[PDB]
């Protein structure tokens, strides 16, 4: 079960379907795994 | 390979490109890779059709698994 509420992104004309659906609790697992690495200072 | 992708395939990776970290993410062996799937164990005189199993890489359907 994915209990409500959700986040929906519309990606097309109205009344056509065409939208992406996110569960905030599942998307947190993808956010909690990215970890951009830290910069390395430019070289002389 | 990384130089080739970053220069010659911008129709796909447009000006963001890739580094090692895009796949290794700090480990020597990447996490999500694949090989040619043999399928479940069946009798020796039975050839594989390549479907009708659980199918973990095709979103758990009964579709062709490789």
């Amino acid at each position: 079960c994915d209990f409500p509420p959700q986040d929906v992104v519309q990606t097309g004309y109205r009344g056509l379907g065409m939208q992406q659906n996110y569960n905030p609790k599942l998307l947190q697992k993808v956010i909690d795994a990215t970890q951009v690495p830290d910069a390395i200072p430019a070289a002389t | 390979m990384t130089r080739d992708t970053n220069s010659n395939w911008t129709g796909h990776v447009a000006d963001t490109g890739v580094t090692c970290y895009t796949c290794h993410r700090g480990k020597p062996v990447p996490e999500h890779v694949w090989t040619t799937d043999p399928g479940p164990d069946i009798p020796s005189v039975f050839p594989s059709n390549g479907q009708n199993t659980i199918g973990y890489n095709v979103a758990y359907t009964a579709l062709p698994f490789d």
């Binding site: 993808v30 | 990384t2 080739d4 129709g11 580094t19 890779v33 694949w34 090989t35």
Partner: protein
Amino acid sequence: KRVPAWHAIRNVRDINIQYVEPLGEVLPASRKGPLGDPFKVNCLTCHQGAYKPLFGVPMAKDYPAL
């Protein structure tokens, strides 16, 4: 978004035909599958469940080696 995916397909084929599969001579038996071929690259090898790998932070511009 259908037009980048079209290029992505071709890109992945390049990575696997020119670079990764010919490495099957160099790697040990640990990095191979049941049929004796090395691990290869998918869409999931860099996206890992996001619409752009790492949400599209441009890391590769800072390094002229890539």
